[PDB]
Design a protein around this ligand. Structure first.
Ligand SMILES: C/C(=N\NC(=N)N)c1ccc(NC(=O)c2cc3cccc([N+](=O)[O-])c3[nH]2)cc1
Ligand SMILES: C/C(=N\NC(=N)N)c1ccc(NC(=O)c2cc3cccc([N+](=O)[O-])c3[nH]2)cc1
Ligand SMILES: [Mg+2]
Ligand SMILES: [Mg+2]
Lengths: 285, 285
């Protein structure tokens, strides 16, 4: 095949940066001669695009352009650090400090999603991009292919009338409705676990308990020797996110107020990284 | 206000037949001089229309025309018998035979919906229309405003991968997923109860138990004197439909195989009514 003409008109395509199940290419925008990343999706991408066009957060990827052709082409800012996945694969592990910097940003991103009525639903190291190859860098969450937009539910509409003809299971669902965002907090819990320890909390490696039973019981694989070097505060947060009951699970707000994230140096590094990214116009006064 | 010009072009509007929360008018189609009903909905109606345009069953209302103007206008076949509601209101009750004829048709309709991946979600006497003012008549289910189209779920897509990062509540939901159609079977249960007895199974009339607790416990209001005259087979079916566990609840197939509906005279009256409705072209042989 060839790249679509409208893409070629605006961009020169270059080397592969990565591969999804999917592919990411380096490209140069002709107008500016600056590097961009182009995600190719083989044929609800257009509504993922609409979601991402309306979100404005430094820790969420921004769409620069979009082409709907033989395949989809999504142009975004280059994230030269690549995926978080590559930093944690093969039992590699990040310093606890670097974990905290990254995780803080993930929480800010996800908090902003949930405030804006969006649930991501596929948070994982593959979908966290690093702005640079330096350890202290900005991260951005990507891939909104599984995301969902919260709004008025069928349930809410049902509850407006009298339940003369309404099934008991609908009434029972009221106790737990409206906590779908908590699935993101679980995933974040799993991400943090992996970042701090270099291994997954739930996996079929050297165990006879099924992955499903591990997850539904909440019984993560704790190896103390790996964790000895990790703070108690870090592990405490992990434990409040990997809570099986979604109504009891920490929200992003609760996580951000956790002792582990009350870290003024970390928050300085983040603010410094932000201003560094920014290329501001002159301002009055 | 005035009726839209495109409606006026094709139809002469006449008297009110009824009122929703909503209104139904008598109209005459100019081309044929024949009577039609026009439902007015003050401003997902257009997709309700698309659902009803693709369904083809004698016990489901057919759309003849549609106008999307200041309000929505939906043209359909006249159902001169009106709503089932009016036959059961004020503790009026139908002969058990008439209940069976009507209910059989409701089951056929709902069975056809569920076969076609549609759940109605608002089955009630108000949404059952009678073709004539005779007791032995055809019925049609109407009002697909709350309906939902079944198809590949997010759940199914989630289960295709590995649940490394997946929340326990999603895995727990697998046990009960795919039974949303059972809400229609519950409602049918409530409709049948009302038809046979002339009173609602669950209501706040002369009780201290909340409507919600009545429904979730499945503890319907049984008044034996009202029921003495009703068969045991009729009440048995009622009980298999008003089953609180949606996985145990009778499906439309199970209901149709129930002893109460193994009634050859009833099924003859229905077939006779069908052929009577029909105005067939000549056929080879
Ligand atoms: C929106 C989206 N996917 N949406 C979807 N699959 N439905 C999406 C998914 C992944 C990305 N990934 C990248 O931009 C991305 C991956 C990568 C790896 C090494 C190096 C770079 N880089 O930019 O230098 C990379 N960028 C970008 C967008
Ligand atoms: C599709 C629909 N509603 N959809 C919605 N509200 N979202 C809908 C709702 C109700 C009806 N009702 C009738 O056609 C209808 C009600 C009625 C009462 C006395 C007499 C007649 N009649 O036709 O002689 C009646 N027809 C027809 C359509
Ligand atoms: Mg994905
Ligand atoms: Mg309705």
């Amino acid at each position: 095949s060839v790249y679509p003409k409208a893409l070629r008109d605006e961009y020169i395509m270059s080397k592969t940066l990565g591969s999804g199940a999917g592919e990411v290419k380096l490209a140069f925008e002709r107008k500016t001669c600056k590097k961009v990343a182009i995600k190719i999706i083989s044929k609800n991408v257009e509504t993922e695009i609409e979601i991402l066009k309306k979100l404005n957060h430094p820790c969420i990827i921004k769409i620069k352009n979009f082409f709907d052709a033989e395949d989809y082409y999504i142009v975004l800012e280059l994230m030269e650090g690549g995926e978080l996945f590559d930093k944690v694969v093969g039992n590699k592990r990040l310093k606890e400090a670097t974990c905290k910097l990254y995780f803080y940003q993930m929480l800010l991103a996800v908090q902003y999603l949930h405030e804006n009525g969006i649930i991501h639903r596929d948070l994982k190291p593959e979908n966290v991009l690093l702005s640079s190859q330096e350890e202290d860098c900005l991260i951005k969450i990507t891939d909104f292919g599984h995301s969902k937009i919260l709004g008025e539910t069928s349930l809410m509409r049902t509850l407006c009338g009298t339940p003369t003809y309404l099934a008991p299971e609908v009434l029972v669902s009221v106790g737990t409705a409206g906590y779908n965002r908590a699935v993101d907090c679980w995933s974040l819990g799993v991400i943090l676990f992996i970042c701090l320890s270099g291994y997954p909390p739930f996996s079929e490696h050297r165990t006879q308990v099924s992955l499903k039973d591990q997850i539904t019981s909440g019984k993560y694989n704790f190896i103390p020797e790996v964790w000895a070097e990790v703070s108690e505060k870090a592990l405490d947060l992990v434990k409040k996110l990997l809570v099986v009951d979604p109504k009891a699970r920490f929200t992003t707000e609760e996580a951000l107020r956790h002792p582990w994230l009350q870290d003024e140096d970390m928050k300085r590094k983040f603010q410094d990284l932000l201003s560094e990214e920014n290329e501001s116009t002159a301002l009055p006064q």
